[PDB]
């Protein structure tokens, strides 16, 4: 009868969930063991790192006092401790860490995915993928905007979207960095300043300058978007081929990976980046000259101009460092 | 000599880091075992849940066809499967889960802190604590603003801060909920609509209506802030005393915990919440009437008015449901 089905269901649930519950309890015990082991190991690593830093400082102090015959041995020793510290950091990267000074405000939670190099590589993949999708979204929006509407409201909607973009992306960069990579630091400031740019331009409504400006600004935005497209495609290709060959750890090789696709891609992208910085400079100059027009007193045009120059300088410096590294 | 110190340092580093590296390797193996076990257990739980849902649907289908003599046994059975499903969900809460439909956009990462009820309770504690700090920050800002400056720019700064507040807090609510609690759903929409309110009011610069309005609006904001203060202090007290007695799992007891401090605190807070909803209604009415003033055509006053009424209705409904539950 229908009751017998329920009875057999009761039997199977009893047996299988008894197994499940016992397994779950043993899971709980194993997890407690794992977390105690992790805590002990992290403490040991911290203690070793402290002693290592002390010894390295002592070596640095003694080095000027060292004559050459001891200095050669000391330099070899410093090299091998440098490698040793690198190895220690590499292993520590397999163990959980503490949020640095920002997610503490934004999350205050543990996040590290120290489960596999596979997990990290995958995560970086969807990081870049989301970048490409949302960027093309902005590109379509920008094209449509410059085409159809003179509304301030459509500009406002686009601007909300842009600032939300950049905040999301700073969270990405934060998680990525505490999970470990070579961010160089000087890139997150770019996103922060771009955010402030967008906020202030969200302010300060219509005015003859505003209409004179919006078209050029939006064209720059579209060009920058397509540049980020090129960035993605190059980075995607080079990281994939690197993973195919050796590791593709995180975006950095100190060597053109394919050395033919990599070098050619870099040398084809560089004119685009130079063009982007150049047209940003042109826009900055236009705004600067316009700021002296006496027909209107705008407390926003100059506060918009200053970040443009700051960001142009930062980009030029980053590109120059990149090419200097590439040459030698 | 100084060299001998380095040699003994080499010896100690060799020994202790050999121990460390062996332990770290055994950690890696144990972690692999743990994650494989977690995957298998989660799969088993999912399969059991699927079979349980199927059986429950079958029982629901058969129930109308069931006569009373079988229906009593069937109802008892449904009760015990309801408890069984609850227990299964409770255990599943100890195991990692998948981000729901939002962090997938915002993070796309695993986050659950299923390490202890201690960890969850602590996290909720700093959640509330951050709330109180940042709220009093806004309170001071608001007082200063209504006091000194008629600048639109100070209003803009306050508004940036407010929207950043609310976005941070929606991230809090998201992590909290996928970590497990009774959010009731209808609260996050409150934060979203408040965010849109603040964005639009960030737009639409000066105008006779703007100056006529800002003072009343900011006063409402200050009152709402102090209300959130009272909210915090009550929730803090009741959750702490609940943790002292039984568990203080997450903010919910279906019973006034102290039943003297809890009931009195609720009945003292309720007038404040009623006052807040009431003054929000007064502000909404003022804006609605002003929207008919023909001296200026503002495409923003009405789009600001509609969320006020929506939010007032939502708050009134939530409070009414709360009091209905409390009465019986």
Curated annotation (Swiss-Prot), chains A, B:
InterPro entries: TMEM120A/B (IPR012926). The chain crosses the membrane at residues 127-146, 153-171, 185-203, 213-234, 265-288, 299-324. It is a multi-pass membrane protein. GO terms for molecular function: coenzyme A binding; monoatomic ion channel activity. It is found in: Cell membrane; Nucleus inner membrane; Endoplasmic reticulum. Expressed in nociceptors. Coiled coil: none annotated. GO terms for biological process: antiviral innate immune response; detection of mechanical stimulus involved in sensory perception of pain; fat cell differentiation; monoatomic ion transmembrane transport; protein heterooligomerization; protein homooligomerization. The transmembrane domain (TMD) has structural homology to the very long chain fatty acid elongase 7, ELOVL7, despite low sequence homology between them. This is Transmembrane protein 120A. It comes from Homo sapiens. The gene is TMEM120A.
């Amino acid at each position: 009868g229908p009751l017998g089905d329920c009875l057999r269901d009761w039997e199977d649930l009893q047996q299988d969930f008894q197994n499940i519950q016992e397994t779950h309890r043993l899971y709980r015990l194993k997890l407690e063991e794992l977390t105690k082991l992790q805590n002990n190991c992290t403490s040991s690593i911290t203690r070793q790192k402290k002693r290592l830093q002390e010894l390295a400082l002592a070596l640095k102090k003694c080095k000027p006092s060292l004559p050459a015959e001891a200095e050669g041995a000391a330099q070899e020793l410093e090299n091998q401790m440098k490698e040793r510290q690198g190895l220690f950091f590499d292993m520590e990267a397999y163990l959980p860490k503490k949020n640095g000074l920002y997610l503490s405000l934004v999350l205050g939670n543990v996040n590290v995915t120290l489960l596999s190099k596979q997990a990290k590589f995958a995560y970086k993949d969807e990081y870049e993928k989301f970048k490409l999708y949302l960027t093309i979204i902005l590109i379509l929006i920008s094209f449509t905007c410059r085409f159809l509407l003179n509304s301030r409201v459509t500009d406002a909607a686009f601007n909300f979207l842009l600032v939300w973009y950049y905040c999301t992306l700073t969270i990405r960069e934060s998680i990525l960095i505490n999970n470990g990579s070579r961010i160089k630091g000087w890139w997150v400031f770019h996103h922060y300043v771009s955010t402030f740019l967008s906020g202030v331009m969200l302010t300060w409504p219509d005015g003859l300058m505003y209409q004179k400006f919006r078209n050029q600004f939006l064209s720059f935005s579209m060009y920058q978007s397509f540049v980020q497209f090129l960035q993605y495609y190059y980075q995607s290709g080079c990281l994939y081929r690197l993973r195919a060959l050796g590791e593709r750890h995180t975006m950095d090789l100190t060597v053109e990976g394919f050395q033919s696709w990599m070098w050619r891609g870099l040398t084809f992208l560089l004119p685009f980046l130079f063009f982007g910085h150049f047209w940003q400079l042109f826009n900055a100059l236009t705004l600067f000259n316009l700021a002296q027009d006496p027909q209107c007193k705008e407390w926003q045009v100059l506060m918009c101009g200053f970040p443009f120059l700051l960001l142009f300088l930062g980009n030029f410096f980053t590109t120059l460092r990149v090419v200097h590294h590439k040459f030698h």
